[PDB]
Design a protein around this ligand. Structure first.
Ligand SMILES: *[C@@H]1O[C@H](CO)[C@@H](O)[C@H](O)[C@H]1NC(C)=O
Ligand SMILES: *[C@@H]1O[C@H](CO)[C@@H](O)[C@H](O)[C@H]1NC(C)=O
Ligand SMILES: *[C@@H]1O[C@H](CO)[C@@H](O)[C@H](O)[C@H]1NC(C)=O
Ligand SMILES: *[C@@H]1O[C@H](CO)[C@@H](O)[C@H](O)[C@H]1NC(C)=O
Ligand SMILES: *[C@@H]1O[C@H](CO)[C@@H](O)[C@H](O)[C@H]1NC(C)=O
Ligand SMILES: *[C@@H]1O[C@H](CO)[C@@H](O)[C@H](O)[C@H]1NC(C)=O
Ligand SMILES: *[C@@H]1O[C@H](CO)[C@@H](O)[C@H](O)[C@H]1NC(C)=O
Ligand SMILES: *[C@@H]1O[C@H](CO)[C@@H](O)[C@H](O)[C@H]1NC(C)=O
Lengths: 450, 450
């Protein structure tokens, strides 16, 4: 059957530290097991863009595979798998793949996000026929695909046209990070270009968000910095479309006929649209946003939805004030730049919150989160495991030596309810000498909390 | 179901070239797919000793996983998987894993051989409680395990005591290379120390085999060379036991109760016991023998069995006169040594024969075989794809750069009966920069024959 070992079922999607108090951390050494993420079989062949979700009863995973250089965007296939957590005599769990689906039909599916659903996985993709710049330049969104893969080997794929898409968007793609299934709703992260002359475009004009780091502020007048912040949403690279984050929401009951819906947040509460991830921990929803724009720090929002079933659903998000480490970027978009400017940059590194931020009682200043960063302000290099507080890093554990190239990282933590052990899996694209561009490595460590 | 794509089912375990004529070869570039061989999840974690068998309807694979240094032997686990060949839109087949079994119970199972059996896999292991030298030093063999893993998730393990083992052997271990299922018989390669002064030890005394390379002869008297060759079977490293190759044969009908049997070849026809592989091509059995002893060249025998009701079973083998390339070795056991000496050396690299040697009409001097070698006479380094004739190499396709460390290689070829394509999979242990000693890489190549 498709179900995790019982010791983990109650330790998944929970806040591991409910203390609200201060803690110290130690990141254990990598635990060896068979990797559930397949590598490339050729030296020049590409495998990239991981998406992972650990659900209560099982996990889903996917990434993109290309028989040529990563610079070759003509053709690709999609590796999808689903499995369970199993305890080993080695003393720690292992990810056991129950079902594999390799999609190679000649259809080019890109930027795919995966989600754990009852008895299987759901994947949100778009079909890539052209360059991303050509995409943003056009007036017509690419083909959006929703596929359901079940443990009984049934696989069903549909083209979708969510409410709010037609006419309002130049392009839309999935945000690569996992989505979730909650309250009979399938919710995926998404982003894309918005036509400034459309209804949404004119409604969302004047909307902007300008984060300020109290310990590292940007010098300038409020109005000018605000104008620059507003102008940062319209990169000329993307043909000055309004680059916007959105959520694809689909009714699971109607999931076969539904065509879903597009829920767009106010840009007063969020930065320029980018790749992201949707999390459900306890009963509360959070949203990670990659920092593609000028803001170098880690973007995590507490989000909540209002569902109207009449095509007018809203989303509200509250930014969690995190300034600790910085993501690598190029030019004036690098990790050292705290000031508003038009930027297409950054890298995908999502965190895992170990603590709630806002609770019924109040706000937790002792908020902690863990993940894998890249140690540099410029280059994607030196992958490093970390636990971080709001203003600073609690602990660091580099993987490999200096000069090791790495790109995307996605982290998930869970607890063994048997022995109370806390495990974190850090999935990262790492540069390998013998395989192709990026062996995607699921490193599993035990986390010590005092 | 557990069954290969129909285009491969009649192209497996066949002689690809029945021509008996001369041919030229070209080795294609590696074809990218998701690797069906899992890597280590830690930089120091060990994954070694691959065993692979492609059967008509499906394939079986296994390797050893250690949570510690490869040199540290206390605990290990065994990754086992079974799957099918599936064509992809990329234009080539891919290995799709259907069933996975990770044996981690704390039992230390090593040197495991796998075999494709009806609706599953069979694995032959021994339990390692001590050093190999202590093993050969002892008067009693370690525990022999036979485990059956089926697609229906049934797993059954037994301790076996084959007829002829007790009292005749210091130790016995599986030969690491895949075994086969043929004519209701389960056959595994094996090797180990034989007690001198035992029944078998006394009967097999005075038995020796001395291959001679006509193009690189060893100077000396025949009697002295014969005495040295005879003495090469008794390395002091193994406490002067007679190191002997054997075959584990088990009746499949009785496979639950059988206790099997041990069939030992005359040492007049074979070199010092070592790791090996049993192949069934057409209706003819072949045996690869690793060159652990003084003879540096590739050892492949044509073999045939005579079965009897009560332990009187025998085996006859004929050495295929191959001298082309050489395996790396240390000291006086290196690739440059053609002369008889007591040697424990070499490395496991098995060939896949593309042509029959002896047939009903006569003997084929145009014999060709393919595989992966290590280009050096001393160090295990520079993995290289090759096609070879009897006396010389036909073609060479290096994998990776110079100085790349590699150890074990196992090669299997099959034909696509749809488009006539010939595919070779070269499975080799390669040194990875980010993963523990030896990422085991299944390289798939299209072979061009003219
Ligand atoms: C597979 O599962 C889905 C939902 O779990 C179900 O609706 C579908 O009918 C199943 N497919 C088959 C062939 O039974
Ligand atoms: C966003 O802020 C602007 C002022 O900066 C305000 O005019 C607008 O109403 C706000 N929109 C939302 C949805 O909060
Ligand atoms: C929406 O989030 C904002 C923070 O950005 C918060 O101040 C506000 O209370 C939320 N709105 C509602 C209706 O809860
Ligand atoms: C980055 O590397 C340097 C060593 O070169 C180290 O001192 C520093 O702490 C690292 N920074 C992070 C965030 O890991
Ligand atoms: C699984 O398959 C094997 C194949 O012979 C069979 O002997 C065994 O009884 C099967 N087990 C179950 C539970 O069906
Ligand atoms: C093996 O060869 C030796 C001579 O070297 C001979 O005396 C012995 O009888 C042979 N044994 C067999 C089984 O052929
Ligand atoms: C056994 O093999 C040898 C070649 O090594 C051959 O000369 C001999 O005739 C064979 N004997 C039988 C019974 O096949
Ligand atoms: C080994 O490498 C050398 C060059 O370093 C090359 O010339 C030679 O042909 C190679 N030998 C084999 C057997 O591949």
């Amino acid at each position: 059957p498709l179900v995790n070992d019982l010791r983990f079922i109650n330790g998944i999607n929970k806040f591991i530290i409910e203390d609200y108090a201060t803690h110290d951390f130690s990141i254990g050494h990598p635990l060896n097991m068979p990797s559930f993420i397949p590598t490339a079989t050729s030296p020049n062949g590409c495998t990239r863009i991981p998406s992972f979700s650990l659900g209560k009863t099982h996990w889903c995973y996917t990434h993109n595979v290309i028989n040529a250089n990563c610079k070759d965007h003509t053709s690709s296939n999609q590796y999808i798998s689903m499995g369970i957590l199993v305890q080993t005599a080695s003393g720690y769990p292992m990810f056991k793949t129950l079902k594999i689906q390799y999609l190679s039909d000649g259809l080019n599916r890109k930027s795919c996000s995966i989600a754990t659903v009852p008895d299987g996985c759901a994947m949100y993709c778009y079909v890539s026929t052209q360059l991303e710049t050509d995409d943003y330049a056009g007036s017509s969104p690419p083909t959006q695909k929703l596929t359901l893969l079940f443990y009984n080997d049934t696989v069903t794929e549909r083209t979708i046209s969510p409410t709010g898409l037609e006419g309002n968007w130049a392009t839309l793609v999935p945000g690569v990070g996992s989505g979730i299934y909650f309250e009979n709703k399938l919710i995926f992260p998404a982003y894309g270009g918005v036509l400034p002359n459309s209804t949404l475009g004119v409604k969302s004009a004047r909307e902007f968000f300008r984060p300020v780091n109290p310990y590292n502020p940007c010098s300038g007048p409020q109005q000018d910095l605000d104008q620059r912040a507003l102008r940062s949403y319209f990169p000329s690279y993307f043909s000055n479309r309004r680059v916007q984050s959105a959520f694809l929401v689909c009714a699971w009951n109607q999931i076969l006929v539904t065509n879903c819906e597009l829920v767009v947040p106010s840009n007063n509460q969020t930065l320029m649209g980018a790749e992201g991830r949707v999390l459900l921990i306890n009963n509360r929803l959070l949203y990670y946003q990659r920092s593609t724009s000028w803001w170098p720090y880690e973007l995590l929002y507490e989000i909540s939805f209002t569902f109207t079933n009449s095509g007018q659903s809203s989303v509200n998000m509250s930014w969690i004030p995190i300034y600790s480490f910085t993501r690598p970027g190029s030019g004036n978009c690098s990790g050292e730049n705290v000031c508003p400017t038009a930027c297409v940059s950054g890298v995908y590194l999502d965190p895992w919150p170990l603590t709630p931020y806002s609770h019924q009682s109040g706000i937790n200043r002792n908020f902690y989160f863990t993940g894998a960063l890249l140690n540099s302000s410029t280059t994607r290099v030196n992958p490093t495991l970390y636990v971080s507080a709001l203003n600073n890093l609690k602990v660091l554990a580099p993987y490999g030596n200096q000069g090791l190239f790495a790109s995307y990282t996605t982290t998930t933590c869970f607890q063994d309810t048997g022995d109370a052990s806390v495990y974190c899996v850090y999935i990262m694209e790492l540069a390998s000498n013998i395989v192709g561009e990026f062996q995607i490595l699921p490193v599993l460590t035990r986390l010590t909390i005092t």
